[PDB]
């Protein structure tokens, strides 16, 4: 079985990041809809150690500021290697995708939503790879 990869690295620096779980709930008392007035509940936590890297190409959809008919919108993304388990959304449930807070190109800090998670069930070592997309500015995603 794997031995070296089953232990923490000692050459490349790694950092911890903050995250938060997400659910949703219905608030309207009389509306007949599952949506109602949707609300999201958060529960914070942290990842043991992570590595953050940017997109490699220069494709038009990967550029940071984009020109739309309204104005120069904003976009960011990352690829993350981590030893913590993060989950995407699951259907027929009230759980949403986990989010984690990282620096952006504008100098601030914003939340990124997990979109793709990679796992190797037959190997055993707990090492994962994630792909993240920054939440739209002015909202908390979906």
């Amino acid at each position: 079985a794997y031995s070296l990869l089953s232990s923490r690295n000692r050459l490349i620096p790694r950092v911890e990041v903050q995250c938060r779980k997400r659910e949703w709930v219905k608030t309207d008392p009389d509306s007949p809809f599952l949506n109602g007035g949707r609300e999201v509940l958060y529960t914070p936590f942290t990842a043991v150690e992570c590595t953050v890297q940017p997109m490699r190409g220069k494709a038009i959809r990967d550029q940071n500021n984009q020109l739309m008919i309204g104005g120069e919108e904003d976009y960011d993304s990352y690829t993350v290697y981590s030893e913590t388990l993060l989950f995407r959304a699951r259907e027929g449930t009230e759980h949403l995708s986990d989010q984690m807070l990282l620096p952006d190109s504008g100098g601030g800090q914003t939340w990124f939503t997990v979109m793709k998670a990679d796992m190797y069930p037959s190997s055993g070592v707990p090492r994962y790879r994630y792909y993240l997309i920054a939440v739209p500015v002015g909202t908390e995603g979906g």
Binding site: Y75, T113, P136, G141, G142
Partner: protein, 59 residues
């Protein structure tokens, strides 16, 4: 002045593959009147000369 209005269409547009944004669109038609000024004028008629010829049988 105002003339009429078109249908109002409500739309949902994905953003960053996470959220749907609400939008709408319409076209409002107005009336108007535009005025422009010429680049000169022609001369006036100050003097008119007319020649007349009366054909007759006596001469």
């Amino acid at each position: 002045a105002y003339s009429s209005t078109s249908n109002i269409a409500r739309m949902r547009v994905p953003l960053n593959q996470q959220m749907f944004e609400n939008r709408a669109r319409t076209i409002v038609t107005f009336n108007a009147t535009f005025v422009e000024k010429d680049l000169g004028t022609f001369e006036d008629i100050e003097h008119i000369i007319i020649g007349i010829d009366v054909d007759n049988p006596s001469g």
